[PDB]
Amino acid sequence: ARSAYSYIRDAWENPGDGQLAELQWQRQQEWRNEGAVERIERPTRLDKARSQGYKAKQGVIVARVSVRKGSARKRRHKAGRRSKRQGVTRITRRKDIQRVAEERASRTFPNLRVLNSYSVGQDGRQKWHEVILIDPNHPAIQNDDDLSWICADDQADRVFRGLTGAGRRNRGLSGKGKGSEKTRPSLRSNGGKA
Amino acid sequence: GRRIQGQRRGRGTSTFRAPSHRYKADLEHRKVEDGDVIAGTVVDIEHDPARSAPVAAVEFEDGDRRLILAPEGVGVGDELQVGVSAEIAPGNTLPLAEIPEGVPVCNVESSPGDGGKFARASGVNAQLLTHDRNVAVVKLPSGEMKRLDPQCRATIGVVAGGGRTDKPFVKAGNKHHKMKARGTKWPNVRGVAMNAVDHPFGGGGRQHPGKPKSISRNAPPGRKVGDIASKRTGRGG
């Protein structure tokens, strides 16, 4: 039969309809009064969290992060540029907001490592995402068969090097064939043309 | 070119800041629960550096010593009242609603409880014209009819120091001293006397704006100089 989880999932396919709509309208009011990064005892989207690797265990932390909406926040050129490099307003950044959110969260918890993240809505001026972070130094995790992999040294600061699911997508690594000529194995090795 | 003086101002550097560390206090009305059971005694009259007008130090019943925006005719020893039931006399503060029409007022609040925003300068006063249950109509010093929430507090009388403007500075040195007590860069160099690089009017063999002075409201900073969005100019017509 359907899992209880599938019901949370199904509710979130249309965050603007049904009960979920009213919950968000209520919640966001509180969220707007909270800081940039707020640790929370439980995921707002359980199905999504467990689906991404979340477990109700010691060493597993979840934090909600908000970020200002819109495009880039850039300073116009003080020195001469050709029409092309004079653009200022419509130029957007290369990292999506989810990625910016994952990094702020990881900076807040220097000792934890980002595992994954997901969207929990937005209003007209900001977006919220919840991030799952793991304590690579806690034995409850060093002994977990499904998470101990994140304890390796090469996994340190993984989010800052784009090793996150959101990181990999944003780097155009989704496709294995056509279109990934300049993304795989890295943007840098391909001269930054992807 | 280079940023014009008007643009240098906004950075808020020392040259353009007001000598705040030298200012006395912000003459905002007292905050009262209600009842008007608040009265104090004028303990001294002082000079307010920021307004070139006098201010009165008051000692209230509950032990609070604070400077107040003084109307004309307030002296040491006098008793002042602040509240809904306050008496209707010079130096007292109470909501417009409690004030009788046709009474000159000063230090009028914009939004009930803000502390006073209007008519705070030397010898000025707002004139409470109309009353109501939803709107108090006041005539501000500029002559404009302002609709205010009857709950906005004000002080009966006109501001002390009137006539200050009737005497000429006579010499630059006097202007100088006054300017040193304000957030203002002085003296003033005309735009037409500068180089083209420094102002829209700079440059040219002889001095003269090389353009019409009436500038559009939409002009960007750096260009908005001269007569801003003038509805007209001159004295004629």
């Binding site: 359907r2 509710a11 439980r42 989207r45 | -």
Partner: protein, 119 residues
Amino acid sequence: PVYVDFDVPADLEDDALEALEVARDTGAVKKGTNETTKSIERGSAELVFVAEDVQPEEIVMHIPELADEKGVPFIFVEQQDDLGHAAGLEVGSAAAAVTDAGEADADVEDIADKVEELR
């Protein structure tokens, strides 16, 4: 709160928990929102409990309507940890389901009745 359409009296909540406590000692009961949900889906449930202090609410928002289109009766409990205790748990429980009572069918019956009445 968004899934709670009626308030249950402290005294009615008392009887229900007791019934649930004897139900675990006698009959069979389900602990957890997932197990509870499947019971309602498999139709193998007589009475389901749903705490009111569940955060996030998503976890249980579906119980009410899911129960209605399945005829299964349900009741609200104020505390999450009480339901877990009454269910015989060392932890809390967001929702519970009495899968076939046990020497409490008479009470579970009355409870379901007092609720339908309470709308």
